Ligand binder design. Structure first.
Ligand SMILES: Nc1ncnc2c1ncn2[C@@H]1O[C@H](COP(=O)(O)OP(=O)(O)OP(=O)(O)O)[C@@H](O)[C@H]1O
Lengths: 836, 701, 158
């Protein structure tokens, strides 16, 4: 029964019984110490990293042995714990031990009743102290003096002194033996505290133990880190060598053996002082709680709020989990407890100051923003790691600008550009693994209760990581210089809007050297800005004025212009995501929405990067506000996470790779109609690009969005369709029949997906004119697919005649793009035809 | 419900009851300090915004604690704040604390009324004080002498120490206990100032807290930068390693674990010295109130005008919002709101001070030039940022010539040549993030009430960065050399006229080659000084004499001839705008009309950039001299902003790229008079150039 | 009393015997802060001198450290440590980029020599330069306020 009180001081001095994390060790260490006395050096070691709780543990051992003095048949007297770091700089350890031993003996002398034995033993104790007084200079002398020899030959010490040389080891051995007679104990326990604060002072502790504490009347327990003692010992064996030999024998044939010889000296020195059978390792909290399936060694519990009793306590694994499940917006699974496992492996001092700063500011706030409460805790707890990792430290800049910059630098050092934007604590480093949960608390807080900020992380945070990996890295020191240009060009950390970043991202996807000159880049199509002869079919120069309301505006945002050697209009999907992020930031006023649609298309002058060598419009704003007001009523309950944002982008980014090359060659002369799946004209490339993002937000958010506790995608294969809609349609169909079984809505379960499928801008891209496949089975799946979207959205997108006109090859459309399919993509010479 | 009186008779250079704003946290901080006494090492770390009132806050912290003694259930006595940098180089902190603890005890001892209590406590203090004196050699000794062992064995002490040795930790612990009894308090607060300006002196502070100040009757409040405290702790951990081990093990396999151990040592050193739950963050103004839509954490009001009552007081966000919009000429939207949030992140003393300078001078000014008014108020509080940014800090040089240099160097330092002329505070460094508002106020003042000075920044101040962004790519310290010589050619520091900046601007754009060498570039077309033989249609050469009044002088103003290895003739919209600046700046006298009118018909050659490898007019004169009569009354109305000037050119610059692209790509032989959009000529392009300028002015205004 | 405390300025080590003389309050001047404070002693010394001289403030003037700019560290340290009173006005001359070079060298001396040699990687070295540049730009800001700095003009500017 270990009940940790988080609102208690929780300090080594204030730690008592029933809240000692190490209790099995304390019970078994005392028995081992006692048995070694019941039957040379008797030295025990307690090992553990910094903050493992060595000082807390070893004080309990002294307390355990001190209690019941006379009752135990074997008698051990414990001196007060010696802390080498807090001792005077130049005093010997033998002086410290004797000074504490003298007081223990002195207080026992003043406790006697008979005036004879007190008088007899007082002079014996004073006689040994005088002998030690005479010989202490042997420790603190810089040289020998001839008159010390006459002191060495003085054999009138009146004691045994089996060897006569003024041996400080023998003087202390008799002094300890006399001290045991007065104190009436079998042995005296010398206790040494850990040297982690300053391990330079630990050499005198190690030297004193082997030189002076060899008596059978002495038992020694020392705490510290063996890898910290090793560098201390190994650093002294290098001082035994003659320096002149070090430079002269600098050859790798002798330097290897010299490094080998020091290893043997260090290995035996550690074995000489601390026998392996006497060592004890301080178990980490994870090693004491085990895992979920396997019961841990102990069942530890913690108290999260003041004023409760011990029955209201919960296990530490759960308490850290709740701070991870809520503070990071993660559901129960293999990625939530894995964050708890990384925190359990942390030092106890570091873990306590997370479990304290969290709940202290949580009980004083609830009497919220749990992700913000955890973020504050992990900012100071991991603060030293943050400085080492070169992240942003200013708390008055904890916003979207800093977070998107941290992600790029975190993966710049994590060496993981593929999946490193999940901020998973899986790195081999300790600092980057510490910042993996601090940066994850950044995402789960800066995106809580929002959709514009969530998409900003998805597009700018995770996006800039991926675009660098596959389009800029091939040119790379250069790598440091390249990042100095990529970040500066893409303005990572200082973006104005997501579309402004998109207007630069779309260039970068085209700036990289791509073969075959085809304009079907990754996530974008390069629509021809001009025309010439030999244009087959209804293929012409792209026109913007051809589209109607909600079709011009939807594509006005989607268009991007790069100011290369020749200006190149680019239509993409990041621009649609960039525009939605900008629009979702706009409030209910209609006087600012028109700025969002128009700031993205005009005044766009994106120069090539240095590393590159070369009124229907009002009828849409009323729909936008009907959706913008729908955003602000549901986005409050949105609980995104670093894993979810990265995972959504992972599924999203893989599709854009598929669509880039699966549709690159599929452009033929008769591709304008798009009746068959073989034809993949520009109106089908971007139809699936938008359907890629909606599917990425469909499955990934159905796996990890913390609002839902039951899986809705179900068992199956998730293939993120390209050139098909069937598997996209079925998953929406499966969720519909599953939500109905639980009588649960389409809004609380998928707040993230619902507000994007209902976005007015994305609607004219779901069903274009050069889009929908027109085979017998294609219309069969798409008839329900269009119906399913209308059902979940809540209103019809296309009327009865609108769907019939698209399936069967004029009536203008206010919600469907028309001229996109007629446009031709740069480098796509339609010199062939679609095979039958 | 904090009310800030900007016109209060009290000087803002002192701290009083709720004179500052952090007192909402200060009460909890005081409570938290008292919270740890009901039950150890209670060390509170105080930080805040970079360069905030670190010294000011802690002085107020101890001021609010020494005042309330009996009305507070738990009594805490505060030592005078210790500045470790202003201390003797070798005096220990334990000596400094005791020397200030002794005076507080001595003053209380002199305040006693009963001799029975005074005598027994005074001798108890001095006996405790003499014990500390006998042990101070341990701190300073460089060698252990055998005579100290007898002192370490002196157990003839009525103080009843716990451990036998001569431990200074418990000698000082018992000394503090006696001091608490004399002063009648439960704890004593030791405060340290920042260790900046000498950060090697903070090690004694850290060691004293670790070893001696770890009692339950002592509260330590430290101030400084943890990034700098980490820097200090890291260095000391390396010195624990033997110099031979460092020299004999330099391989990266060992050098990495060596650094992976020290970083673990400093990680647990701060977590032990400064617990995370005790670290205090000095909130900025933005955190105290929040956002416009988000519910206010604590309503805070500022007295805009003297004599205004608390009911009529307005929120701080609108207090600076009204001030910034009036001074920066910005509407109530999001462009000015991001400047409001920028000023809300400033130190809480600086925000109240900049408000005072603007409002107090406004009251005197009214009893206007508000953009001038805000510049002087911002200059007083931002002068540190301008000086370290290399900008114009000369208080009498805040004119037009220096403004062009400031915009150029701001963009260069901020490293954004495509959007840095918007002067938004989007930078990361504090100096550049704070120089935007000052420069925005400079632009919002120099152009307010005038027309020629609107174009003198759009064409020169803001137009110098878009040309460079069209220039750096074709060429790429050499970059540092490029910007220095770029200013010299444009004469950005000293522009004698805007018609001369555009005269040298055409020679820069024309240097860059085009596709097929059409002779069309940004916002201009390259004319031919010599005719081309056998041109289909009527594509002859150009002679100015053919044109008529208002069609010859206007063309001559747009005309520009650049001397190079090949003589070239140019016409540009930029040259046309330069003529407007000279006429607008010139007076209304008819004799003064000609000097600008003749200058735009000077027909003077322009030197190629060094980096390159190379009365008939009375009809126009009356119109221009009458238009400027209409100019004078219009100039009063226009209130330009830095945002407006950049936005107008942004659309203007971008459109000329399209105009030069949608017209050069149509090769033609008989398209002199364009009946369809698929036809173009030399004059038809210049139609769309001025339309690009006029449309951009129309939409953005 | 100023002579009694001058040893602190020149001492190469702390003498534990001076602690007995750092505890006496026998002075009738009643210095507010406990212990002998050279900054405090000079304050009432200047305050006393203002009454004798019958003046509101005393102007301390320093020449420029040109022939030997190492000697200016004591000037900089004495200004902030001692010459901070309402009765004292300080005017200093010299190249500002020479004082900055002098302060920069001192900020590097607060770094342990072992740390400088053992951490030569660019990520740590660059951060050290940013800290030193920030440390010495604030040192000049506190010592020499910008609103009080005056720049001598040359003929080209005259
Ligand atoms: N049994 C325990 N119960 C509660 N909290 C504990 C326990 N053991 C350790 N802790 C927490 O972990 C921290 C670790 O400090 P501790 O002094 O015990 O470890 P150490 O680093 O080995 O010692 P030192 O402070 O001498 O370097 C404690 O301050 C406390 O917050």
């Amino acid at each position: 029964k270990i009940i940790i009180n988080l609102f208690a001081p929780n300090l080594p001095g204030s730690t008592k019984e029933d809240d000692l994390i190490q209790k099995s060790l304390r019970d078994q260490l005392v028995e081992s110490i006692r048995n070694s006395i019941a039957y040379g050096r008797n030295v025990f070691f307690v090992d553990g990293t910094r903050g493992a709780g060595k000082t807390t543990f070893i004080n309990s051992v002294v307390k355990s042995l001190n209690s019941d003095q006379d009752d135990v048949k074997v008698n051990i007297k414990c001196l007060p714990t010696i802390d080498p770091t807090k001792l005077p700089r130049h005093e010997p350890i033998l002086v410290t031990v004797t000074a504490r031993l003298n007081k223990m003996v002195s207080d026992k002398l003043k406790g006697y009743w008979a005036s004879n034995d007190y008088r007899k033993q007082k002079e014996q104790w004073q006689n040994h102290l005088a002998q030690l007084q005479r010989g202490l200079h042997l420790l603190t002398d810089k040289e020998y003096k001839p008159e010390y020899f006459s002191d060495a030959l003085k054999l009138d010490a009146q004691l045994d002194y089996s060897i006569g040389g003024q041996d400080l080891s023998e003087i202390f051995e008799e002094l300890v033996k006399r001290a045991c007679e007065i104190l009436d104990c079998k042995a005296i326990l010398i206790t040494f505290d850990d040297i982690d604060t300053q391990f330079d002072a630990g050499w005198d502790v190690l030297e004193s133990i082997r030189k002076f504490f060899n008596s059978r009347k002495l038992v020694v327990v020392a705490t510290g880190d063996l890898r910290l003692y090793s560098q201390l010992i190994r650093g002294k064996q290098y001082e035994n060598y003659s320096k002149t030999l070090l430079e002269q024998e600098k050859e790798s044939v002798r330097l290897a053996e010299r490094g080998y010889m020091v290893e043997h000296l260090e290995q035996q020195y550690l074995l000489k002082l601390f026998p392996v059978q006497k060592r004890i390792q301080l178990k980490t909290m994870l090693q004491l709680v085990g895992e979920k399936g396997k019961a841990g060694k102990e069942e530890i519990k913690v108290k999260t709020e003041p004023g409760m009793q011990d029955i209201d306590a919960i296990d530490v694994r759960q308490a850290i989990g709740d701070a991870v499940r809520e503070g990071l917006n993660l559901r129960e699974g293999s990625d939530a407890d894995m964050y708890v496992n990384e925190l359990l492996k942390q030092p106890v001092r570091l873990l306590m100051q997370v479990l304290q700063d969290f709940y202290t500011k949580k009980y004083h706030a609830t009497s919220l923003s749990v992700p913000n409460l955890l973020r504050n805790a992990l900012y100071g707890s991991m603060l030293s790691s943050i400085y080492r990792a070169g992240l942003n430290y200013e708390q008055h800049r904890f916003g979207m600008d800093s977070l998107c910059k941290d992600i790029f630098t975190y993966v710049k050092q994590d060496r993981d550009f593929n999946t490193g934007f999940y901020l998973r604590p899986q790195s081999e480093s300790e600092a980057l693994r510490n910042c993996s949960i601090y940066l994850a608390s950044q995402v789960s807080e800066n995106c809580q209760g929002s959709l514009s900020k969530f998409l900003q992380m998805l597009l700018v945070g995770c996006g800039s990581v991926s675009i660098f990996n596959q389009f800029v890295t091939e040119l790379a020191e250069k790598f440091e210089q390249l990042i100095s240009e990529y970040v500066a060009y893409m303005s990572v950390g200082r973006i104005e809007s997501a579309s402004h970043w998109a207007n630069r991202c779309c260039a970068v996807v085209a700036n990289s050297p791509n073969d075959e000159k085809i304009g079907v880049f990754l996530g974008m199509v390069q629509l021809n800005r001009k025309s010439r002869q030999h244009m087959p079919g209804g293929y012409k120069k792209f026109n913007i004025d051809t589209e109607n309301g909600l079709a011009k505006a939807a594509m006005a945002s989607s268009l991007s212009t790069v100011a290369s050697n020749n200006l190149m209009d680019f239509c993409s999907v990041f621009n649609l995501i960039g525009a939605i992020a900008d629009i979702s930031a706009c409030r209910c006023e209609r006087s600012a929405i028109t700025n969002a649609f128009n700031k993205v298309i005009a005044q766009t002058t994106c120069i090539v990067p240095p590393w590159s060598e070369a009124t229907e419009f009002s009828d849409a704003i009323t729909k936008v506000e009907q959706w913008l007001k729908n955003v602000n009523e549901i986005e409050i309950g949105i609980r995104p996470s670093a894993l979810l944002i990265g995972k959504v982008w992972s599924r999203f980014y893989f599709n854009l790779n598929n669509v880039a090359d699966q549709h690159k060659t599929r452009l033929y002369r008769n591709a304008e109609h798009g009746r068959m799946a073989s034809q993949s004209n520009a109106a089908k490339i971007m139809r699936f690009n938008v359907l890629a993002f909606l599917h990425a937000v469909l499955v990934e958010e159905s796996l990890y969005h913390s609002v839902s506790d039951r899986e809705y995608i179900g068992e199956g294969l998730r293939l993120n369709p390209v050139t098909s809609v069937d598997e996209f349609e079925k998953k929406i169909k499966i969720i519909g029949e599953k939500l109905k079984a639980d009588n649960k809505t389409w809004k609380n379960t998928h707040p993230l997906f619902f507000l994007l499928i209902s976005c007015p801008i994305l609607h004219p891209f779901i069903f274009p004119v050069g889009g929908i496949n027109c085979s017998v089975k294609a219309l069969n799946k798409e008839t329900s697919f269009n119906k399913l979207i209308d059902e979940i959205v809540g209103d019809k997108l296309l009327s009865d005649e609108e769907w019939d006109y698209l399936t069967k090859n004029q009536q203008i459309f206010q919600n469907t793009i028309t001229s996109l399919n007629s446009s031709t993509i740069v480098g796509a010479s339609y010199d062939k035809d679609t095979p039958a």
